Amino acid sequence: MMLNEVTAVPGTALPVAEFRDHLRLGTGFADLGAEDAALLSYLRAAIAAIEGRTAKALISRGFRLALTAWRWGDMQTLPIAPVATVTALRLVDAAGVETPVAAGWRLVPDMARPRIEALGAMLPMIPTGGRVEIDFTAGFGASWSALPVDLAQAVFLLAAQYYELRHDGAAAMPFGVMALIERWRTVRVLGGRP
């Protein structure tokens, strides 16, 4: 289970022109672009902070889930939660040959449990000494407008903070950064074997 990203976000999909409206920089100056190189450096640093505390994705970039042994006999819950249209469960071999498999696997969409449950009571078997990478595109939407807005606000509450204080300097809201995140975190109570 490695879970790397195939492609990153384009950067042009991030709302730098709206984050600048948030931070109260300035309206009609002739410069207007001295911060563009750094404002998206804090938006990518605040999304990636909330992508890890919530285990959500938010831009629907493509992922690659390269794993070897199945976690449970048939289920295989995916880590990145809001998914749609798993592309390919290409089953690599011990070395080399990569054979994509329709394989009779389904996809159960959920924000909490994005399973990949199999229908033939057993997922496609795994060549001993070989991995099973799964290409899937997981996230809310393609553009910034398709997000839940409270999670989009939690980026703006957080990336404004990184813009206003640079080093770790200490400085209570009703719905702060944390209270907006908490309905998007994963609530789990299993430490067991299954």
Added chain:
Amino acid sequence: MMLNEVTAVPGTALPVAEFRDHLRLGTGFADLGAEDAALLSYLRAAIAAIEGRTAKALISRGFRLALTAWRWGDMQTLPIAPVATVTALRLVDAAGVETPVAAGWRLVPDMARPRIEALGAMLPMIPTGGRVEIDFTAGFGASWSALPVDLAQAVFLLAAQYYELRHDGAAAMPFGVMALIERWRTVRVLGGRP
């Protein structure tokens, strides 16, 4: 259970002209200068914070509840609470034949526990692999004026807070944001198997 919204708000349904009056009317600097479309972006962030803490809907948007297995035998509590009129309970199969049903169920509306509660003991079974899918319209009313005004004030107490201070800065009111929400939260005491 994905539960994505079919359509969002139009934006013209939101009280941006009224929220400018809750921001500075009768006392203030003047009407002053506020990026109008910015003020729409804080109302959508305060509603989506109260739509999540209360599990209400507040604008009567259209929903699509596509879940695989029925939880109870017949009950199926709907999460987004103030509901009216299931659009359709179409039932897709594993291939996508999408055969709707038109009888066998009677939505029992309620602000506490909206249900589906089919007739007798038979609720439409699920094609194996073929997720069931329920389209409904949930919320109070089409315009902003049809809301309970205490819940509308919790938006204005919250959307003004996101306007007055940007980052997560520190700052116990009797009926604050939190005290106006708690009579609209869902009070549940089940952690059990049914």
Added chain:
Amino acid sequence: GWASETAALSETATPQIDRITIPLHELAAMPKASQRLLDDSAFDIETW
């Protein structure tokens, strides 16, 4: 596979196990019979 002597034979494919579900639907009839018609007639209506 036919195993050679200098082969150092690899493991083969365990056969896939299928699990096909019977849904076990219901089939019911609810006839409506009149009480007077069941009490007057010479025929055994509850048997018929």
Added chain:
Amino acid sequence: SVTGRIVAMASGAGRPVWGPRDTVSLMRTGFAGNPVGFRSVKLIAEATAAVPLICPVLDLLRRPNAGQGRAELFEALIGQILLSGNGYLEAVCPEPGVPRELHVLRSDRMAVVPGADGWPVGYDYTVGGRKHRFDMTGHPDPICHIKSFHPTDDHYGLSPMQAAAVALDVHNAASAWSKALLDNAARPSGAIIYKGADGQGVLAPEQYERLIFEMETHHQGARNAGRPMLLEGGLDWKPMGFSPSDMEFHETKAAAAREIALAFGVPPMLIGIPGDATYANYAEANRAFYRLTVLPLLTRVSAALAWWLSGYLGAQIELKPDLDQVPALAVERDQLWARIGAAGFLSNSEKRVLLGLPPT
């Protein structure tokens, strides 16, 4: 009789009536599942087979069929009565009188038919989806149907396992409580808490293999029990406990293990469950076993074999338990021989006729 004719047409004549739904699931969960429900039936069914009988016809009973002896027949017969309240015996009659085959038909796959006058006309042996439809519209009536007493039902028995069906599920799940507690439980014998300079801090994998190897070698095991364990700054050892150690549903299982033995009627002393001493010294509890739940059970089945098999003969035959040279009733035989043997007033031939002797 007259009431029965009315009862039939309510349920439906000519159509099978099934009765108990779960009787196929109480066998796997109550007779193959727990030892107390297993031993209780095996204690009775092996007791009724051991009791001799008093009458020809018993030559059939001694050798009913191939691979199913006399004692093996009643173990199969009573083993269906204790499990599902119903006993069945198919008779194959190539010959008109005393049919030379007996077969204990299992009561999971048998269903009754009420027929016209309320008393049964059909029995249906249903395995898979395939039926047989035995016929009762004749005189020999090829199946004896031994019912346990059921007050609410008109066609089946009550099956004491159904009466103990709550105490089986307590004893099955309390015993499976302790199994899965010994299989899903993480107790540690301690925890080396490492906070650090911060409130949180990991230790590097260089330091961590040092920490395993001084714990693997010098602290765990019987041979390292009690090393003084220097803790420098940051490290700390919090020993954990295990607060319920013994006795996880120990008495509620042992009370349920007694209610299963209560329902079939075996005493707690015979089966071996623990409990307070009710009976004294096994001359009673074995005598109580062959008087409250074996010989009343055996004289009820033998009264049905005495009437069903006499329908194949011309003359009717009685068939009763021996109630003599069954060695659990020796304390009722000492007590009756020493009473009349010590009664010296009445003469010699006057007491051979009392004790059951051939007179001289």
Added chain:
Amino acid sequence: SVTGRIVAMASGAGRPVWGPRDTVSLMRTGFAGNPVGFRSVKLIAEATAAVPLICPVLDLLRRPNAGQGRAELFEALIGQILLSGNGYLEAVCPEPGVPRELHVLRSDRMAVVPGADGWPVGYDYTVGGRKHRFDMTGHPDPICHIKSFHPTDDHYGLSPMQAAAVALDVHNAASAWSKALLDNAARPSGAIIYKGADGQGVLAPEQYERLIFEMETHHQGARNAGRPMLLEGGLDWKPMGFSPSDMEFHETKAAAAREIALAFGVPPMLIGIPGDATYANYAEANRAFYRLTVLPLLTRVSAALAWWLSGYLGAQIELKPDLDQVPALAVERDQLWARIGAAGFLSNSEKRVLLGLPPT
């Protein structure tokens, strides 16, 4: 037999029926694994072999084959019945009558074939991928198949270990709980905590070898138990405990060790498990053992040898346990000889016919 044809088709005629998969694993986990399941079968199988028999045929039973004596045969035969509910006996007949070889075929590798009329036509001894297909479509029928009573299955026995299969896994894992607790546990007898001026501070390897040598020499061991142990600034000694000391699942193991003994039917006094005194003084518990779980088992197997071996002879032979000069039944023999011996009213030959003597 008339219904025999209906059940045969559902299973599938001519094809092997296996029954329980996990049968071989209950042997390794429940009979080679724990002493209670080990002793309970060995206590019974060495008791049924010791009981003499009453009939020629017993000349075969006395010397069945090479290297497998009379008493060694029934230990193998009953040892399969208690373990897997099924007993098998191959007869090899170089000679036409009374075949001079008997072999207990183990019931792990044996499978039934239902055949046409429901009663079996084939038995399959399956070792490796190799089958044998014994044939039952003949008159001598070369394998006797002794079934324990199974109400739900039509072809096998129930094997009391299967009914106690939860209580075996409790007793196997509670005993392995205390084993791995003695092997994975770090208890210290204390901890010399060294904080320092800061909240954290190590001590130098000069100071650390000083701390070992005053702990190695002057404080550890039996001979240094209680030195007054000066602690300067920074140092502190927190003595640890071990809060559950005895009794890790001690009663749930001792309760599961009785439920294993319950299912096989041995009394708790014979096997040696601790527990409340149910039976009194071994004149009862040994007499209860040979009356509730040995002699009913032996009279059921001997009744199958009385019929299978009589199929090789012309005349049918009876074969029953002796129930005389078996020295566990002496309390039932004192009680019956002193009853009739004290009955002085009836004459001398009138009680020799009661006690079983040849009259004179």
